[PDB]
Structure formats: structure tokens, C-alpha cells
Design a protein around this ligand. Structure first.
Ligand code: CA
Ligand code: NA
Length: 140
């Protein structure tokens, strides 16, 4: 499986902090820059759950998803998640769920090959009551 080029993707989120330098637009989750993050809105706080959706630029049989947390600081490190896919951009189905430790470690989801044009990462819980992501990648 190979990471799909992020430049063919479009990221949208249910909440994003505006650009205050290196956070927190959704698009910052797929820019190839480890120092830039998506972060949920927090002037003032928009409470979880919140999600980020990646439009993949095509139809792919995907089988792996990686979540790279922000480096150093911990706010928004996602600790309870669901991963959903859509073949159409409209209807989403849950394909993975669980808990993640709050470290900055890469979190990797491996699942049975599934057709998707979109992937959605739902943050149910995250450090500080926020969600953030330095880099999201999707593999086919
Ligand atoms: Ca980034
Ligand atoms: Na779409």
C-alpha cells in the first residue's frame, strides 16, 4: 500500500481554528508539513465530537490510514476516534474505532480493503477537549 498524494486531496472539517501561524486549518492536516496542524476551533472552544474529511480525488480501494499528532505539545492529540469511509461523499460508514494513547506517536489504522472516495476521521475525545492532526495519510 502506498500513500495517496495529498495534493490530489481536499480537506474539510466540522471545526477548524483559523490560520494563526501553523494552525489550525483543516488543509494543514494534508500539506506534507509536520510542523503545521489542523486544530479544532478554540476562540472560543467548539466542543468535541468534531471531524475532518478527506476527499481523495478519486475512487480507491484503501486499506491503511495514518494519523500523525502535532509535535511536542499535546493539545488535540486524539484519544478516542472513529474512521469512516464514503463511496459517494454523502453516506459514510464506520470502518474502525477505538482508543489511542495521548503520546505524539504515529497512530496507524490497518483494515480490510474498502472502496472510498472520502475518508472521515471523527475525534470523539482528545487532549484538552480539542482535536488536532499534523499529517493524515491514506493508503491504497
Ligand atoms: Ca501539516
Ligand atoms: Na466530496
Amino acid at each position: 500500500a502506498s500513500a495517496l498524494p495529498q495534493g490530489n486531496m481536499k480537506a474539510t472539517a466540522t471545526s477548524e481554528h483559523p490560520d494563526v501561524g501553523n494552525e489550525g486549518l483543516a488543509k494543514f492536516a494534508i500539506d506534507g508539513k509536520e510542523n503545521t496542524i489542523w486544530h479544532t476551533k478554540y476562540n472560543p472552544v467548539e466542543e468535541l465530537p468534531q471531524s475532518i474529511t478527506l476527499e481523495l480525488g478519486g475512487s480507491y480501494e484503501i486499506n491503511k490510514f495514518t494519523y500523525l499528532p502535532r509535535s511536542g505539545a499535546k493539545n488535540g492529540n486524539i484519544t478516542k476516534y472513529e474512521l469512516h469511509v464514503s463511496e459517494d461523499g454523502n453516506n459514510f460508514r464506520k470502518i474502525s474505532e477505538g482508543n489511542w494513547d495521548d503520546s505524539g506517536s504515529l497512530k496507524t489504522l490497518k483494515f480490510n480493503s474498502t472502496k472510498a472516495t472520502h475518508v472521515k476521521l471523527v475525534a470523539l475525545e482528545g487532549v484538552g477537549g480539542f482535536a488536532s492532526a499534523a499529517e493524515l495519510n491514506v493508503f491504497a
